[PDB]
Amino acid sequence: ASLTEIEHLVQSVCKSYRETCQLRLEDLLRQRSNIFSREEVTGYQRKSMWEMWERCAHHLTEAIQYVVEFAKRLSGFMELCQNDQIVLLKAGAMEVVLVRMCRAYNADNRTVFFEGKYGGMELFRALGCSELISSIFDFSHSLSALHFSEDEIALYTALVLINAHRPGLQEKRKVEQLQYNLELAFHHHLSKTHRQSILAKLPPKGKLRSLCSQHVERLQIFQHLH
Ligand SMILES: CCOC(=O)[C@H](C)N(C(=O)c1cccs1)c1c(C)cccc1Cl
């Protein structure tokens, strides 16, 4: 891929992201003043773990579907064999969802957009896993400090997804190639926007992976229990 071919990769990634981002950034920013009251928060805390688990499962189900659609629009993701597509989505989809959260997150008051309004982690008290919820918020807090642009989120989420170290791939070398192409594409774009300094600030890959595994473990405790 030459100059025009790396810039085309950039833009196709930004395209998929734009067409699949679920919630527009301007809407999310405009809504930051729209915050759950004390009665509404208490209304959420009083709900059973089961109903709360139900609303979160639906939220996480809807968010994951847009991520699946993001994948399917990625130049070269289709060219991968169907088996490998599945291995990537299985291991990465929820990780991308975790990253995507930072846009719906207000570091000013440590709140997140949920079901029409902004609220803190104490919204989710009834689930009984604040340590995990607080990790997710902290993760989103430290990402929100980098002020990711829409494009950087596009490229970075592509790279969360396209990872050749996912256990059980069949065409591992072809997944490696695409990954290498996106890495360069991302690095180039950062150089054109004078944003290279974020690279040293990007979390250790094992942070996401570790947080997500902990998230899936609780999710499986939930799925079996209800
Ligand atoms: C493991 C069970 O706990 C959750 O489902 C929690 C409530 N939760 C999440 O797990 C999320 C994980 C990734 C994006 S949201 C979440 C939701 C659904 C909306 C807003 C903020 C968060 Cl942190």
Secondary structure of the chain in HEC code, one letter for each residue: CCHHHHHHHHHHHHHHHHHHCCCCHHHHHHHHHCECCHHHHHHHHHCCHHHHHHHHHHHHHHHHHHHHHHHHHCCCCCCCCHHHHHHHHHHHHHHHHHHHHHHHEECCCCEEEECCEEECHHHHHHHCCHHHHHHHHHHHHHHHCCCCCHHHHHHHHHHHHCCCCCCCCCCHHHHHHHHHHHHHHHHHHHHHCCCHHHHHHCCCHHHHHHHHHHHHHHHHHHHHHC
Distance from residue 56's CA to the centre of ligand 1 (Å):
6
**Residue among 110, 115, 133, 224 to mutate when testing ligand 1 (max atoms within 8 A of CB):** 133
* Distance linking the first and last C-alpha atoms of the chain: 49
127: Cβ below 6 Å to ligand 1? yes
Q: How far is CA 14 from CA 3, 17, 211, 226, in A?
A: 17, 5, 26, 38
Structure's resolution in angstroms = 2.3
Cα 1 to averaged position of ligand 1 atoms, centre (Å): 39
Q: How buried is residue 3: exposed, middle or buried, by Cβ count under 10 Å (0-12/13-18/19+)?
A: exposed
Shortest-distance atom of ligand 1 to CA 60: 18
Closest CA to 23 of 100, 121, 108, 136: 100
| Structure method | X-ray
Give yes or no for residue 219 CB within 6 A of ligand 1: yes
Ligand 1, atom 2: closest residue by C-alpha = 219
Check: CB of residue 36 under 8 Å from CB of residue 94.
Answer: no
What distance in angstroms lies between residue 133's CA and the mean position of ligand 1's atoms? Answer: 7
CB 124, CB 56: distance < 8 Å: yes
Place of tokens 């989420």: 157
- Number of domains forming the structure of the chain: 1
Atom of ligand 1 nearest to the CA of 104: 20
Residue type, 26: E
Residue 181 structural domain: 1-226
The single residue listed with the structure tokens 């400090």 is 145
Whole-angstrom distance, CA of residue 226 vs CA of residue 221: 9
Contact between residue 84 and residue 170 where contact means Cβ atoms under 8 Å apart: yes
57: domain CATH number?
Answer: 1.10.565.10
Q: Is 204 exposed, middle or buried (0-12, 13-18, 19+ CB in 10 A)?
A: exposed
